Amino acid sequence: DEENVYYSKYLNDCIMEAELHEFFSRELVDAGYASCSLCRTIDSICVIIQCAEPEVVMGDNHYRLHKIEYLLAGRFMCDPKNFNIWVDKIIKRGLSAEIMVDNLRAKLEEAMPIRRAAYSIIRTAMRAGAAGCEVIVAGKLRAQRARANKFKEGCLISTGHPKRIFLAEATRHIKMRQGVIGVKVRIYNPNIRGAVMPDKIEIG
Amino acid sequence: RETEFCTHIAHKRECRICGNYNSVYRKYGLFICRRCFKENAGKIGFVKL
Amino acid sequence: DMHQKYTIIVVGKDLKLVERYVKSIVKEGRAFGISGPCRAPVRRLTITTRKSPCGEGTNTWHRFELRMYKRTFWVTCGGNDISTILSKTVVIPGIQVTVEVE
């Protein structure tokens, strides 16, 4: 028959992964939240969360990862010990846009001149080896009228499939006092271990 | 009060991410909003050509 | 002998994460006689949504597809040998390998 209900549970698991990425973003954003992946073994769920600061995520005595394990399992109808979470560290932090955008969001709420902070984020990705970084801050920046302040440094690419692979992007709705501003950090890493630019011809 | 509180029984299908009744995408399991869905489709993995 | 044909159904959205897992299933079960992969005809989950949050402007639609990949193997081997195979095969997070007993 074509019933094949195996696809339906696969879909249900991915929907939980989307919820997981949304819950972690609200709580573990201070704790360097970048991304989550769900793993199902023999009826076992273990989530890999990529974070800049695993120690805050873990907590002292790992009571914070335990309390949130108990919560996520309790929410997803699992029992603790039938599931667990695993937190990994982020290396070359600048190339991670989600980490950079929350760094920008912090310095903007710390009342730093915007262009000063934007070049600071750009330099943290420039140090990391990104070919370019593009910061767009849009909102009521000190004025009732809204203007979008685009700051950019080095080459960035915007078209084709190598945008999905080489260019990372990160939007944060930082709620400033006057209304709400939006910070978008984009990093372009020309070189990664796997695929290479489909145009760049090396020529010896 | 409970005699009439929600005495009408009808589907209250609502987007899982938003909570909005209008335009719930019940194509399969997903009950996601149409304005809520194209936002998180990369996390669900749906992608375009 | 408690010998049964054991079903192995793999679902991976990512063709390369799923295709490498097909190599993994073949190698671990080479000893226990794993089956050649019967790849399910791809099932595409298709949703078309208007690109506009507010329905105004030229009609622009988003064509979104989840091209789930399912590959099925059957092994007539020991339950401890089926279990060794599950431990032996590469663990890719977000990949569904499911076993039924025939």
Next chain:
Amino acid sequence: MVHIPKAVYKAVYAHLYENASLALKEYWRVGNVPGITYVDENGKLCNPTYLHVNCIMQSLESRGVVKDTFAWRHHYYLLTEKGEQFIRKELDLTDDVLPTP
């Protein structure tokens, strides 16, 4: 007036204390919360009102005893030390008894 059976109040404290957390889908129509069971005075099996747990929950976050995070139409309440003392006092457990985590 949502007069609350003390069994429902007592049950949530324990369910939450064991897990040090709670997940509540936001539901305000008549319903019974899954995962909480209060034994009725006649030995019956009962599930607490989605409204009643929500009302007790509104008091706890407002007190400042418990933290909450919200995503996808589900509340994500967690225990905090400030209310660990209160929940133990309600549950009669002490500093030696810890949330099972």
Next chain:
Amino acid sequence: GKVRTKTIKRAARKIVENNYESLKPKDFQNNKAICSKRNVAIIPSKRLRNKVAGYVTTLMNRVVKG
């Protein structure tokens, strides 16, 4: 018809500057085989590699007369 772009064009000259004898005047497969020798000339994608070879074949054809 099909107009060669600057990548498909500058690289073709760089190939005829470095290599002369290996490519031949009307030999697309040979011009595709020389341009495909891994590190000596690296062009990701056959479509780009084939297009390069066709321009090399045209450049090689031009040089042989004069």
Next chain:
Amino acid sequence: EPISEEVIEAIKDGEITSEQDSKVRARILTDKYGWDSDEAKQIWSFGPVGASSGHMTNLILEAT
């Protein structure tokens, strides 16, 4: 609306003055002068050039 003399005597005394927190004078007007409590809180200003007799008050506030 004519102001009651007792409110005016307090205006001259300084119990109710333009130069005061908005709420403090509101409590005085409602708790001694039988004023509408919402109206006492919504008083926009005193008149004329100085803050003598003469008051301006806001709307019902359901329609504010």
Next chain:
RNA sequence: GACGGAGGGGUACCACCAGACGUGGAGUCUGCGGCUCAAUCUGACUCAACGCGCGCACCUCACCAGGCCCGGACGCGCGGAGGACCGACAGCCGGGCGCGCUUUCGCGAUCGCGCGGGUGGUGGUGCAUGGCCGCUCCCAGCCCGUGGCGCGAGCCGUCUGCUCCAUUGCGACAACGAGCGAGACCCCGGCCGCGGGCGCCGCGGGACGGCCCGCGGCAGCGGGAGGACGGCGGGGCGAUAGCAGGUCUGUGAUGCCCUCAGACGCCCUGGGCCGCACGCGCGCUACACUGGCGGGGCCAGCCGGCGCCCGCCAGGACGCGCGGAGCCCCCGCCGUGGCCGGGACCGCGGGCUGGAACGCCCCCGCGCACCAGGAAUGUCUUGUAGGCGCCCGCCCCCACCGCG
């Protein structure tokens, strides 16, 4: 730089040419204005509003006519435990509800009251905003390093020539090299191979203006084959800037007014959103003999269940694990007649789905306009237009719609 109601060049079936198939003319379907209302909730008004904000009996639902309910958290001053707070049989009243009323029972600090201080609101303002789309853009611009020329702002590069689908390249030339956008890439398709095969489904080749003949310094410009495939195959992605485009009514996006309890919260019932002197937009069905009407073959693809019995049907009961269009063709028939063209309206019924039709289906009547559409206006280049069905989206029911 921004504009010009200035001169040139260039370009595109959202331009034209040459053609196509249309619409505007009729009936209806749906949206828009107006009109009418208790309410007809609203945005949107040139392209870039108007089958648009993916199906309005209920819900949705924001609007109207009524009626519950605190589900007002925390904090303080007071109140209350022999008694805070709400429940209730029966009768009346009321569509109905212990809503109130008569009554006299319950009930157990989950709390009352005063003040503060909340939480919620499809309320407003998109001309306070984030985000996301539309549009300029079914285009081809946008920059930099070093040098040259200017006292500089700066220009050159990035060019009044040619080529292109293209700022795509050539050629000339104080420029010389790079980048982003274009392309490449990604997806699907045709063909060959490899490995597998509950099921055709994984990886590799192949095509490059390569070759040939012209005409060209040239980029290329026609032709010829060979080859599944030929000269941008059918899509995705999309620069620099933008614009008071659209959205606060998608969101636990949001600033401000925050309504906040005889509520703009939140529920329940009833009604509307579908009301119609009218004018318009997207459609559908027509005006027939290249057709209608009967039987006979046969046939798909996105991707796909059926059996049996009762029923003209529509459907129903009871089961199991499974299956497929029309156009067209073949034979009769009608025979130019508003006719068997056309199915609009309306009188019975029989069913379906639901709590409830007003929704739909079916059946027997009933057979309106319309005999090819005025000024105008649209879209289109090979598996194309058109013609023909089918699937899904949203959905209790239901597609003249959209996406395929």
